[PDB]
Amino acid sequence: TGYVGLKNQGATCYMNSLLQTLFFTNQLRKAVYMMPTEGDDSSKSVPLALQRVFYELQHSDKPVGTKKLTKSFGWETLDSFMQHDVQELCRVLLDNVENKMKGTCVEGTIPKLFRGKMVSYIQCKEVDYRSDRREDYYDIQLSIKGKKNIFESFVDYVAVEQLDGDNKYDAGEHGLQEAEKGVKFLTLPPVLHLQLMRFHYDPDQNIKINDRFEFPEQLPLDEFLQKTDPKDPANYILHAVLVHSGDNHGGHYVVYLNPKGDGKWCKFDDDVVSRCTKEEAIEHNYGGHHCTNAYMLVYIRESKLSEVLQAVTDHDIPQQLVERLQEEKRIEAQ
Ligand SMILES: Cn1nc2c(=O)n(CC3(O)CCN(Cc4ccc(-c5ccco5)cc4Cl)CC3)cnc2c1-c1ccc(CNC=O)cc1
Numbered sequence: 001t002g003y004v005g006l007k008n009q010g011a012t013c014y015m016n017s018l019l020q021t022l023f024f025t026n027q028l029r030k031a032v033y034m035m036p037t038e039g040d041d042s043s044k045s046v047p048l049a050l051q052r053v054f055y056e057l058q059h060s061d062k063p064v065g066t067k068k069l070t071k072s073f074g075w076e077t078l079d080s081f082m083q084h085d086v087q088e089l090c091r092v093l094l095d096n097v098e099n100k101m102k103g104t105c106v107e108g109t110i111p112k113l114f115r116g117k118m119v120s121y122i123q124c125k126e127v128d129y130r131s132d133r134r135e136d137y138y139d140i141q142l143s144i145k146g147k148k149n150i151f152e153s154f155v156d157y158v159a160v161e162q163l164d165g166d167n168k169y170d171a172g173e174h175g176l177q178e179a180e181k182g183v184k185f186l187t188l189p190p191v192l193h194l195q196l197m198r199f200h201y202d203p204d205q206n207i208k209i210n211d212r213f214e215f216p217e218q219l220p221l222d223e224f225l226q227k228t229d230p231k232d233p234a235n236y237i238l239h240a241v242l243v244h245s246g247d248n249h250g251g252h253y254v255v256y257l258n259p260k261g262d263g264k265w266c267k268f269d270d271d272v273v274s275r276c277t278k279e280e281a282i283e284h285n286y287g288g289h290h291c292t293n294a295y296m297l298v299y300i301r302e303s304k305l306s307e308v309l310q311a312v313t314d315h316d317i318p319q320q321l322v323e324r325l326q327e328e329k330r331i332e333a334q
Pocket of ligand 1: 014084085086087141195196197198199200206207208209244247248249251295296
């Protein structure tokens with residue numbers, strides 16, 4: 001396939017899937033290669049550890065290990081990953097690499113790639129008061145229970161909620177008031193991270209939601225924006241499908257990618273990477289009928305696709321870093 005896998009080194013759950021996803025965000029990968037990690041101590045540095053994983057994923061012929069990386073951000077106990085969501089790990093990783101890019105020539109790469117803006121509003125029904133606030137986001141958690149596809153998820157996510165009764169809004173000078181609450185999307189980022197809400201609480205444990213939930217290859221999002229742009233419609237192309245199979249923690253995590261965005265899909269199952277059909281990356285992961293389904297999707301804005309998937313060569317990795325990692329290998333070999 002020309003792509004290499006990642007080793008199974010414990011119950012790291014989504015971790016390898018997310019690492020392959022981030023590695024094939026080529027613009028992110030190049031920015032990570034530029035990070036000034038010469039002075040870093042290797043035992044403690046997450047940015048250096050992500051640099052290392054990416055370098056190996058780009059050059060290694062054998063499955064890549066991840067032990068230095070998990071040590072660097074300190075999720076080292078038997079159940080450390082079972083106690084966090086995939087977006088929490090992504091946050092830990094991207095926060096580290098963007099704090100490292102402060103003051104550098106690649107500062108802002110993470111906000112530029114993954115941050116969008118929305119508005120959260122409260123409009124009073126019986127008096128004249130509307131409270132607006134802008135929030136940034138790096139990911140979207142989409143409810144699926146009782147929703148047939150992504151589209152109904154986005155409708156449910158922007159739908160109006162009612163505040164009244166014993167839950168009425170405190171409009172300050174206006175006292176308690178009846179109101180509506182809601183969010184609109186102001187900006188959608190070039191890379192769109194969508195978690196699906198498949199891991200829930202039952203009337204008293206946690207259960208997996210294996211319901212059918214359709215997601216498309218091409219996703220139009222113009223109609224969930226507050227104001228659109230005719231020059232850049234909000235059309236996204238499906239880039240990654242992170243899949244879990246099973247109804248409990250004894251399940252198995254894999255990820256399907258079309259790394260180039262050209263519709264040629266591969267299955268990354270830890271150390272095995274294999275060519276797969278389009279039906280097997282997408283429809284076969286809808287759920288419904290089994291227990292195999294998507295819990296997270298990555299989309300790229302078509303207008304930014306080629307810039308986010310720009311070719312990476314080995315002259316993109318600075319020689320200081322190639323030297324440090326090759327010296328690491330050379331000490332490992334003695
Ligand atoms: C409700 N909800 N569901 C979620 C979900 O599924 N994901 C994906 C995973 O993180 C978790 C499941 N993994 C797969 C798996 C592994 C084991 C089992 C299982 C079932 C029974 C025993 O073991 C079931 C599953 Cl599905 C893969 C990564 C991420 N976020 C989810 C949220 C959520 C909603 C709002 C906020 C607030 N945030 C901002 O306001 C924060 C989180």
